[PDB]
Write an enzyme that holds these catalytic residues in place. Structure first.
Site, short mmCIF file in Angstrom:
data_model
loop_
_atom_site.label_atom_id
_atom_site.label_comp_id
_atom_site.label_asym_id
_atom_site.label_seq_id
_atom_site.Cartn_x
_atom_site.Cartn_y
_atom_site.Cartn_z
N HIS F 201 0.80 -1.22 0.00
CA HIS F 201 0.00 0.00 0.00
C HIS F 201 0.83 1.26 0.00
O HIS F 201 0.27 2.33 -0.24
CB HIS F 201 -0.93 0.09 1.20
CG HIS F 201 -2.07 -0.87 1.17
ND1 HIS F 201 -2.85 -1.13 2.27
CD2 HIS F 201 -2.57 -1.62 0.16
CE1 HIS F 201 -3.77 -2.02 1.95
NE2 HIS F 201 -3.63 -2.33 0.68
N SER F 205 0.88 -0.61 -6.86
CA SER F 205 1.26 -1.70 -7.73
C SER F 205 2.18 -1.22 -8.84
O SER F 205 2.27 -0.03 -9.14
CB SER F 205 0.05 -2.38 -8.35
OG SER F 205 -0.74 -3.01 -7.36
N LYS F 227 -13.78 -6.92 -11.88
CA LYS F 227 -12.87 -7.77 -12.63
C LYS F 227 -12.38 -8.92 -11.78
O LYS F 227 -12.25 -10.04 -12.28
CB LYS F 227 -11.71 -6.95 -13.17
CG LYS F 227 -10.85 -7.70 -14.13
CD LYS F 227 -9.88 -6.78 -14.81
CE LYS F 227 -9.07 -7.53 -15.83
NZ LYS F 227 -8.14 -6.64 -16.57
N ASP F 228 -12.12 -8.69 -10.49
CA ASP F 228 -11.80 -9.81 -9.62
C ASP F 228 -12.96 -10.77 -9.48
O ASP F 228 -12.76 -11.99 -9.54
CB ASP F 228 -11.35 -9.30 -8.25
CG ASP F 228 -9.90 -8.86 -8.25
OD1 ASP F 228 -9.16 -9.28 -9.16
OD2 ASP F 228 -9.50 -8.08 -7.35
N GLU F 271 2.96 -35.84 -4.65
CA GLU F 271 2.02 -35.42 -5.67
C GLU F 271 2.69 -34.39 -6.56
O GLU F 271 3.83 -33.97 -6.32
CB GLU F 271 0.73 -34.90 -5.05
CG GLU F 271 0.88 -33.75 -4.10
CD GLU F 271 -0.43 -33.38 -3.42
OE1 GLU F 271 -1.50 -33.71 -3.96
OE2 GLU F 271 -0.38 -32.79 -2.33
C1 HEM Z 1 -0.46 -17.13 -0.04
C2 HEM Z 1 0.48 -16.44 -0.68
C3 HEM Z 1 0.23 -15.05 -1.31
C4 HEM Z 1 -0.80 -14.24 -1.22
C5 HEM Z 1 -2.10 -14.41 -0.41
C6 HEM Z 1 -0.50 -13.10 -2.01
C7 HEM Z 1 -1.34 -12.06 -2.15
C8 HEM Z 1 -0.95 -10.96 -2.81
C9 HEM Z 1 -1.85 -9.93 -3.14
C10 HEM Z 1 -3.34 -9.93 -2.80
C11 HEM Z 1 -1.17 -9.00 -3.76
C12 HEM Z 1 -1.75 -7.70 -4.30
C13 HEM Z 1 -2.26 -8.01 -5.68
C14 HEM Z 1 -1.05 -8.04 -6.55
O1 HEM Z 1 -0.18 -7.16 -6.35
O2 HEM Z 1 -0.95 -8.93 -7.43
C15 HEM Z 1 0.19 -9.46 -3.84
C16 HEM Z 1 1.20 -8.78 -4.41
C17 HEM Z 1 2.44 -9.27 -4.58
N1 HEM Z 1 2.89 -10.46 -4.11
FE1 HEM Z 1 1.82 -11.79 -3.13
N2 HEM Z 1 0.71 -13.22 -2.61
C18 HEM Z 1 1.17 -14.42 -2.18
C19 HEM Z 1 2.35 -14.99 -2.50
C20 HEM Z 1 3.37 -14.28 -2.99
C21 HEM Z 1 4.66 -14.84 -3.20
C22 HEM Z 1 4.99 -16.30 -2.89
C23 HEM Z 1 5.41 -13.89 -3.70
C24 HEM Z 1 6.88 -13.94 -4.11
C25 HEM Z 1 7.66 -14.97 -3.82
C26 HEM Z 1 4.59 -12.72 -3.80
C27 HEM Z 1 5.03 -11.54 -4.27
C28 HEM Z 1 4.19 -10.53 -4.52
C29 HEM Z 1 4.54 -9.35 -5.25
C30 HEM Z 1 5.91 -9.09 -5.86
C31 HEM Z 1 3.47 -8.59 -5.29
C32 HEM Z 1 3.31 -7.20 -5.95
C33 HEM Z 1 3.44 -7.27 -7.46
C34 HEM Z 1 2.88 -6.01 -8.07
O3 HEM Z 1 2.28 -5.19 -7.33
O4 HEM Z 1 3.01 -5.83 -9.31
N3 HEM Z 1 3.33 -12.97 -3.36
N4 HEM Z 1 0.30 -10.68 -3.24
C1 HEM Z 2 -3.60 -23.38 3.04
C2 HEM Z 2 -4.48 -24.11 3.72
C3 HEM Z 2 -4.59 -25.63 3.57
C4 HEM Z 2 -4.00 -26.44 2.72
C5 HEM Z 2 -3.01 -26.15 1.59
C6 HEM Z 2 -4.45 -27.76 3.02
C7 HEM Z 2 -4.05 -28.85 2.35
C8 HEM Z 2 -4.48 -30.06 2.70
C9 HEM Z 2 -4.12 -31.22 1.97
C10 HEM Z 2 -3.22 -31.23 0.74
C11 HEM Z 2 -4.68 -32.23 2.56
C12 HEM Z 2 -4.60 -33.69 2.13
C13 HEM Z 2 -5.64 -33.85 1.04
C14 HEM Z 2 -6.28 -35.20 1.15
O1 HEM Z 2 -5.84 -35.97 2.02
O2 HEM Z 2 -7.21 -35.50 0.38
C15 HEM Z 2 -5.42 -31.72 3.66
C16 HEM Z 2 -6.14 -32.49 4.48
C17 HEM Z 2 -6.71 -32.02 5.60
N1 HEM Z 2 -6.81 -30.71 5.95
FE1 HEM Z 2 -6.00 -29.18 5.09
N2 HEM Z 2 -5.32 -27.75 4.06
C18 HEM Z 2 -5.41 -26.43 4.41
C19 HEM Z 2 -6.17 -25.94 5.41
C20 HEM Z 2 -6.77 -26.73 6.33
C21 HEM Z 2 -7.50 -26.22 7.45
C22 HEM Z 2 -7.65 -24.72 7.73
C23 HEM Z 2 -7.93 -27.26 8.13
C24 HEM Z 2 -8.77 -27.37 9.39
C25 HEM Z 2 -9.61 -26.41 9.73
C26 HEM Z 2 -7.51 -28.42 7.44
C27 HEM Z 2 -7.79 -29.65 7.87
C28 HEM Z 2 -7.46 -30.73 7.15
C29 HEM Z 2 -7.76 -32.07 7.54
C30 HEM Z 2 -8.48 -32.51 8.82
C31 HEM Z 2 -7.30 -32.85 6.61
C32 HEM Z 2 -7.42 -34.36 6.60
C33 HEM Z 2 -8.68 -34.63 5.83
C34 HEM Z 2 -8.24 -35.34 4.60
O3 HEM Z 2 -7.06 -35.19 4.23
O4 HEM Z 2 -9.07 -36.06 3.99
N3 HEM Z 2 -6.79 -28.09 6.34
N4 HEM Z 2 -5.29 -30.37 3.75
#
Ligand code: HEM
Ligand code: HEM
Ligand code: HEM
Ligand code: HEM
Ligand code: FES
Lengths: 379, 81, 62, 288, 102, 379
Positions: F201, F205, F227-228, F271
């Site tokens: 902020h 951007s 658009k989002d 995977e």
């Molecule tokens: C769960 C992971 C992430 C979330 C929720 C997230 C979310 C966001 C959001 C909502 C924005 C503002 C919209 C935008 O600028 O595109 C943003 C900007 C950005 N994020 Fe993340 N992002 C994630 C992961 C990452 C990662 C892994 C990277 C780099 C390794 C990254 C780098 C950036 C950059 C460079 C910007 C600004 C780019 C620009 O403004 O042109 N983000 N991110």
């Molecule tokens: C970024 C957030 C999350 C990711 C990437 C994620 C990813 C996963 C993945 C890859 C599995 C295994 C998929 C499968 O076994 O079919 C899994 C299973 C599970 N996740 Fe998450 N999860 C997230 C958030 C959560 C949250 C917030 C909860 C609880 C509130 C949760 C509870 C579970 C449970 C209980 C399982 C076992 C159920 C199952 O695998 O069948 N996960 N999750």
């Protein structure tokens, strides 16, 4: 602000909401319960965590597993005892943190109060559910009573209960839920907390005399930071001294027996901090009307700000308005011990008496008390 | 400070626009569009395609070279001796 | 000339934002009642004799 | 845009150079004949002593009547649009917003005369203060959200314009636009009998005080004939005013204001003036 | 789509087909004359038997002498008894009446 | 700001970090992955929750319970399938969200990039642990490989592993942990996210041409919010279409068999989205040196900002700097399919070749490419 390191990451300017937050000069120790809630909250989540790693949620397993902690896990006995007793030392803070609220008339802050109300109302839910988790005898029946009580609603009642139970009774799927809730839910409290603190930064704290303190302010870093630490220290003993020498004292429920739905324990009560609420209920013979009071018990706290009846904020200057207030203290204290007693005609009448008095003080007397004294001082 | 007020200084730049009602949601979408896609599809395609092409060859070549090795045992060493 | 179906419609409904909201509710209300019923037949007409709905007639009530 | 009405009075500069007296004589010849022309006067004159010395040239030099077709006139379109001349040097930033309205002769012409009295107008230098009645003269005087603004009302032959004109500093421009659209929208729903009066009175006041002096009377007579015909309905005005009632206003302004397409034109430092699709989304309450 | 979606997540929590495999059909059994005893639990343990599933109490209500037919039991039971009984709470005084013993 | 409702609770002025946040005019759809990460994150936690209520963590129970969901629970089959496939549709977003990062040179923002790096690095941990929870065959051995791999550390290695396992092997207490972690940990990601968005902020951007956009800005509410949403909609199909018609397609692991420590499956892989990392490892014959590469694989993303070698930010104007970049795409894509193949000699050599190329592009070529073009344009 030349090379002041407080700007450079922005996030640290957000961290001058603490350090230079100006404060009144004179502040009683009674304002330390601001912090000691937080630290009692953090100390949970951790100690709340390392229990989770060895706990298991199953009707067959759960109780066995809690056995397994106190016996076989290195340092496993302290944690379970820090967690449970870390709950009681949480409320005993919490109430005081309301008490300061009234008696100095801090509720004048209108929004921060409300968010205060909810923030209470949530905890009472959490510190409930967890209390089911051990799946002991007093947890099982103490579960049925509270929930089944909710059937009072005229039509949707019968369904709405069966919904939560996920069945006809408190068997498995009713347990597994109350683990997954009691786990997540504190984080939300932590979420609100950083809101509940926000609005406060706009108007600053109140101060014991109930006077706008503007002319006299103090940096928050060198002074109150120590005093909270000092405050933070006295807790530990009060926590340790209890949890270490006398584990089960405040652990008043005596029942570790694995729940048997067939048997029933002769006496059944929640743990202590709930009792008075549960005591209100026994008073009303009429079931439905009975439940409302219990719900209406706390909510009245929200209506108090409408009742500010006088021209000066504090109760430190109003003898009458102070006189009554203490009677309300014993009145609660009464309710506590009342509910902790069997339902036998010497007790029965009493609770019915103390019930009306309770509301009569808050809802009639106190708002009247301010009126007279305005008239006295010639205001 | 506040975002919009102080952004930058611009001078003598005039803007015109219409209500969204007066005008249409598709000003010759297909007719004016379909050429536009093409002229801007080719500008990149010179820079994009070739590397992927290299991959697919490797992939196909890789499988065949893989196949001959394993599947046919009596290939390099036939069953005589 | 009489106003085109829209020209009426806009004046009667979409002007007042209340009605403009209300009409939406009743709209989805009737919508799902008719819509869902059609979708089954189309699907069901695809599979004939592959469902007890037809198959169950061989053995149902003996 | 796209009608003869859309153009400057004096016209673009280049025509001023190329203009030859040929066109003039043609333009002279075309438009100066009667019935177009009208004579008027007010003063010690009565009528007769004029009409004899009305008479002979021009009886007259004609002043003719033939055709010149008829009457070169034709309705004009209303284009909801925007324009911004963005110039960041100047100290202050003008704005004008407007919505189209009826022509000279029409009943609704009176109702709207009154509304723009009610919203009222404020300026830097009044002795009003913060106690004024006009809800935009109380607010925008409090914080000086805008240096000054007036509402204008212009009615052409078949067409008229409604809207205000306000000056304010660039950081402040947003807050006018909102508090403005508060007014128009609280009129078209929540208006009230009492507040009408203070509007109604002022109109009676200004209408009459406009008639002091020789020329302001005569000047009126001139346009009136070309406009409403002979009518100088002085006492009738009052009779036309008592028409105005609560349900009169809110049925009138519901037409021209609620959910329309405004016309915005501004002159730099406009920059903070919101993008168009805000304004259009600010004309119609969602009940907020 | 919202309405369907919302019910879905919520309809999950609603109930389960397994606990739905409860609601006794059996009942059926047994005791003799006194016993009582005669309980089980099973969140139910139609009846059926016939019909019945009305009520008297929990744990082999099971009927009022099964309207003089069978019950378990058939009222009286052992100390105290089936309906009247008392057998109210620890154990007195109002028994299983009511009036008709139904 | 007269009676503007945006002040009155303060919290809403914090909510004008969205609505009036000024933005560039021209923005490609490639910037929609800002939001679509968030929504793919929320949609987890819920659908991630309602799985928890019926799941049970035990060596004896767990697998039975997952059976119990798909069979007996009303609407129980959709959720498990939304959750799992809701993971893959999470990464496929995530990578693109990095890709936009390089190719327009957004990494010039120096802090926001870094917090980007961590925020990635965490997810890869979460989406791992959960993948153990079903306790199926491919979960058991796929657990041993990854962890036991960590023993490479010269001295403390042997202990440090046995520590996490809480024993000699992957039996119970190793499971219970990985539930309590996989549960909490996403909340922390949500915590960082509201930081990772913060610094942004301040500078606004970037925009596709790589030019300071100051003169041209637009309100965020009427325009990009639609658009989002439009962006938010196309996800659902891409999520639904996959999860509904073809459940197991991207569900590439075929193994539901209850884990038997004695048997071993012939082929073992993570995977899909992991593979390429796991492919890097097989290359290095030397064990210890092998692990470092895998750790060094991602971290190099942090060093990229030091390598900005040219006078213009975008790669849309640099043909060379664009030419190479695409080769890197196929290079990764190569690695993916490579690791997904057995370790016979036609494959073996290839991975070793593609390995060096990968670094050579990032770490040598690209920083050189900018140098020449400066020289070309006469800069
Ligand atoms: C769960 C992971 C992430 C979330 C929720 C997230 C979310 C966001 C959001 C909502 C924005 C503002 C919209 C935008 O600028 O595109 C943003 C900007 C950005 N994020 Fe993340 N992002 C994630 C992961 C990452 C990662 C892994 C990277 C780099 C390794 C990254 C780098 C950036 C950059 C460079 C910007 C600004 C780019 C620009 O403004 O042109 N983000 N991110
Ligand atoms: C970024 C957030 C999350 C990711 C990437 C994620 C990813 C996963 C993945 C890859 C599995 C295994 C998929 C499968 O076994 O079919 C899994 C299973 C599970 N996740 Fe998450 N999860 C997230 C958030 C959560 C949250 C917030 C909860 C609880 C509130 C949760 C509870 C579970 C449970 C209980 C399982 C076992 C159920 C199952 O695998 O069948 N996960 N999750
Ligand atoms: C305000 C925060 C919390 C409160 C008031 C609270 C309260 C309680 C209470 C009263 C019990 C029952 C005490 C007992 O059975 O001895 C309990 C048990 C438990 N709590 Fe919490 N708790 C909190 C936070 C947490 C957190 C953050 C976690 C997990 C990270 C957690 C996990 C557990 C578990 C697993 C149990 C069952 C262990 C046991 O009861 O022996 N609690 N909690
Ligand atoms: C977990 C629950 C709570 C936490 C973490 C918490 C924390 C705090 C903290 C740190 C402060 C600033 C220090 C202070 O002003 O004393 C505060 C102020 C305050 N809280 Fe809370 N509090 C909690 C519960 C409540 C409740 C339940 C209420 C009312 C029902 C409440 C009402 C107030 C009021 C009125 C103040 C300001 C009083 C003053 O400034 O003089 N708080 N709270
Ligand atoms: S570690 Fe045993 S095969 Fe790689």
């Amino acid at each position: 602000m030349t090379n002041i390191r407080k700007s450079h990451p922005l996030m640290k300017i957000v961290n001058n909401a603490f350090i230079d937050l100006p404060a009144p000069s004179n502040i009683s120790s009674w304002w330390n319960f601001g912090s000691l809630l937080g630290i009692c909250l953090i100390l949970q989540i951790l100690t709340g965590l390392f229990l989770a790693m060895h706990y298991t949620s199953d009707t067959t397993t759960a109780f066995s597993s809690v056995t397994h902690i106190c016996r076989d896990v290195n340092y496993g006995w302290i944690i379970r005892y820090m967690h449970a007793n870390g709950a009681s030392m949480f409320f005993i803070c919490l109430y005081m943190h309301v008490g300061r609220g009234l008696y100095y008339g801090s509720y004048t802050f209108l929004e921060t109060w409300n968010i205060g109300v909810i923030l209470l109302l949530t905890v009472m839910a959490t510190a409930f559910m967890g209390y089911v988790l051990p799946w002991g005898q007093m947890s099982f029946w103490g579960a049925t009573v509270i929930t089944n009580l909710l059937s009072a609603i005229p039509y949707i009642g019968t369904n709405l209960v069966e919904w939560i139970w996920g069945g006809f009774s408190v068997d498995k799927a009713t347990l597994t839920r109350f683990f997954a809730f009691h786990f997540i839910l504190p984080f939300i409290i932590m979420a609100i907390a950083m809101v509940h603190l926000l609005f406060l930064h706009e108007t600053g704290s109140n101060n014991p005399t109930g006077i706008s303190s503007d002319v006299d302010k103090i940096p928050f870093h060198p002074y109150y930071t120590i005093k909270d630490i000092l405050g933070a220290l006295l807790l530990i003993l009060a926590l340790m001294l209890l949890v270490l020498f006398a584990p089960d004292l405040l652990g008043d429920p005596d029942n570790y027996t694995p729940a048997n739905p067939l048997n029933t324990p002769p006496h059944i009560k929640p743990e202590w901090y709930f009792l008075f609420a549960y005591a209100i209920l026994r008073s009303i013979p009429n079931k439905l009307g009975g439940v409302l009071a219990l719900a209406f018990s706390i909510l009245i706290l929200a209506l108090i700000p409408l009742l500010h009846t006088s021209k000066q904020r504090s109760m430190m200057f109003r003898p009458l308005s102070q006189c009554l207030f203490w009677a309300l203290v014993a009145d609660l204290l009464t309710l506590t011990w009342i509910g902790g007693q069997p339902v036998e005609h010497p007790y029965i009448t009493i609770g019915q008496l103390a019930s009306v008095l309770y509301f009569l003080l808050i809802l009639v007397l106190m708002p009247t008390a301010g009126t007279i004294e305005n008239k006295l001082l010639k205001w | 400070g506040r975002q919009f007020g102080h952004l930058t200084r611009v001078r003598h730049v005039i803007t015109y626009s219409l209500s969204p009602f007066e005008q249409r949601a598709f000003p010759h979408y297909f007719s004016k569009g379909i050429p536009n896609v093409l002229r801007r599809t080719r500008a990149c395609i010179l820079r994009v395609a070739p590397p992927f092409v290299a991959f697919y060859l490797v992939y196909t070549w890789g499988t065949q070279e893989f196949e001959k090795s394993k599947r046919k045992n009596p290939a390099a060493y036939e069953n005589d001796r | 000339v009489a106003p085109t179906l829209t020209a009426r419609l806009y004046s009667l409904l979409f002007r007042r934002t209340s009605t403009f909201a209300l009409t939406i509710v009743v709209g989805a209300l009737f919508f799902e009642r008719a819509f869902d019923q059609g979708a089954d037949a189309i699907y069901e007409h695809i599979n004939e004799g592959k469902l007890w709905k037809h198959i169950k007639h061989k053995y149902e009530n003996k | 845009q796209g009608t003869p009405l859309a153009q400057s009075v004096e016209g673009p500069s280049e025509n001023v150079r190329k203009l030859s007296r040929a066109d003039l004589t043609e333009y002279l010849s075309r438009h100066y004949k009667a019935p177009r022309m009208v004579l008027a006067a007010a003063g010690g004159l009565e009528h007769r002593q004029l009409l004899d010395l009305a008479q002979k040239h021009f009886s007259g030099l004609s002043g003719t009547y033939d055709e010149d077709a008829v009457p070169t006139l034709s309705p004009c379109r209303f284009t909801g649009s925007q324009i911004c001349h963005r110039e960041d040097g100047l100290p202050l930033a003008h704005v004008a917003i407007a919505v189209e309205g009826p022509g000279w002769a029409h009943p609704d012409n009176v109702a709207l005369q009154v509304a723009n009295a009610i919203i009222g107008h404020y300026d830097c230098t009044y002795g009003g203060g913060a106690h004024l009645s006009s809800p935009l003269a109380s607010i925008a005087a409090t914080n000086k959200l805008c240096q000054s603004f007036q509402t204008f009302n212009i009615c052409y032959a078949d067409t008229g314009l409604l809207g205000a004109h306000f000056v304010c500093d660039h950081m402040s421009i947003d807050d006018m636009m909102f508090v403005l659209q508060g007014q128009w929208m609280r009129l078209c729903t929540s208006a009230t009998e009492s507040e009408v009066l203070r509007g109604k009175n002022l109109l009676r006041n200004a209408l009459v005080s406009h008639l002091d002096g020789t020329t302001p009377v005569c000047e009126d007579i001139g346009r009136s004939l070309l406009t409403y015909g002979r009518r100088i309905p002085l006492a009738e005005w009052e009779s036309r005013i008592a028409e105005v009632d609560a349900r009169v206003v809110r049925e009138v302004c519901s037409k021209y204001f609620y959910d329309q397409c405004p016309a915005v034109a501004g002159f730099g430092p406009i920059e903070q003036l919101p993008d168009y699709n805000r304004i259009r989304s600010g004309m119609f309450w969602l009940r907020f | 789509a919202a309405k369907n979606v919302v019910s879905q997540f919520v309809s999950s929590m609603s109930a389960s087909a397994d606990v739905l495999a409860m609601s006794k059909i059996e009942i059926k059994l047994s005791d003799i004359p006194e016993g009582k005893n005669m309980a089980f639990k099973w969140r139910g343990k139609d009846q059926e038997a016939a019909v019945e599933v009305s009520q008297l109490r929990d744990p082999q209500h099971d009927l009022e002498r099964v309207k003089k037919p069978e019950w378990v039991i058939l009222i009286g039971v052992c100390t105290h008894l089936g309906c009247v009984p008392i057998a109210n709470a620890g154990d007195f005084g109002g028994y299983y009446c009511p009036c008709h013993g139904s």
